[PDB]
Design a binder for this molecule. Structure first.
Ligand SMILES: OC[C@H]1O[C@@](CO)(O[C@H]2O[C@H](CO)[C@@H](O)[C@H](O)[C@H]2O)[C@@H](O)[C@@H]1O
Ligand SMILES: [Mg+2]
Ligand SMILES: [Mg+2]
Length: 244
């Protein structure tokens, strides 16, 4: 029932330029009732909350955490989404395979969750190994997807997660149209967002994988911002003429 569904990543997107973050929130703070806000971050919910206290993030309506593996409503964790992602998902088997790759090191336990298996790619290893991993995982028949970002982070998720799939789910939940949605991102774990039909903005300080993605799949609905961090979000809002 609002005119805009604003979905943004936190680190290096909404966060990173304190001054821009502040004037973005100042502006949005004057029309809080005109948009729904969702933070689609790679961070776990707890980590997202700690970041909010650190930089003073304005309260969102929804939290799409751990790359969309967990959704939090004002009332709490979405159990329907959890059950939906659990269907056909076989975490143990995928982890056994990923654990077998010498170039991969598990990320700390707190970065893991039932629908998220994450690793760090050896900076000395050949990035081509991610393609081999992806092929090997896909051939298990288990609905899985591999998210590679910043040239070092690897996340194993159900094919039904993404920041993009979590976003389409939220859109349907709120009865918001893609034309009324703006996704904001900076890296490989944001590609799912740009795969949706929502309007999107790629921050100036975006990672290589995202820019390369844009070069190949970028379309009319995708905006390459001149500003970096939160400034890119204000820029996009004006560009797509949202919150008229
Ligand atoms: O957003 C980039 C920045 O976030 C961190 C915070 O720890 O990593 C998060 O996003 C990664 C990509 O999805 C996940 O693999 C990781 O588990 C999650 O914490 C930084 O590592 C990263 O540079
Ligand atoms: Mg980021
Ligand atoms: Mg990102």
């Amino acid at each position: 029932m609002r005119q805009l569904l604003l979905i943004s990543d936190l680190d290096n997107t909404w966060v990173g330029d304190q001054q821009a973050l502040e004037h973005l929130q100042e502006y949005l703070g004057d029309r809080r009732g005109n948009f729904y806000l969702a933070y689609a971050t790679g961070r776990s919910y707890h980590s997202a909350r700690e970041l909010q206290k650190q930089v003073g993030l304005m309260e969102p309506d929804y939290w799409l955490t751990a790359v969309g593996s967990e959704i939090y409503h004002p009332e709490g964790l979405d159990q329907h989404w959890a059950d939906y992602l659990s269907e056909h998902w076989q975490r143990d088997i995928l982890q056994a395979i990923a654990d077998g790759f010498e170039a991969l090191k598990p990320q700390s336990p707190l970065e893991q969750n039932p629908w998220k298996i994450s690793y760090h790619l050896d900076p000395q290893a050949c990035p081509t190994v991610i393609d081999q991993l992806t092929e090997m995982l896909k051939e298990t028949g288990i609905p899985v997807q591999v998210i590679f970002s910043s040239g070092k982070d690897v996340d194993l998720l159900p094919q039904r997660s993404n920041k993009g799939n979590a976003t389409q789910y939220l859109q349907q939940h709120l009865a918001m149209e893609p034309s009324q949605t703006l996704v904001c991102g900076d890296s490989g774990n944001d590609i799912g967002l740009f795969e949706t039909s929502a309007r999107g903005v790629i921050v100036r300080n975006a990672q290589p994988e995202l820019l390369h993605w844009y070069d190949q799949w970028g379309d009319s609905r995708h905006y390459r911002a001149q500003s970096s961090h939160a400034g890119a979000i204000l820029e996009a809002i004006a560009h797509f003429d949202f919150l008229s």
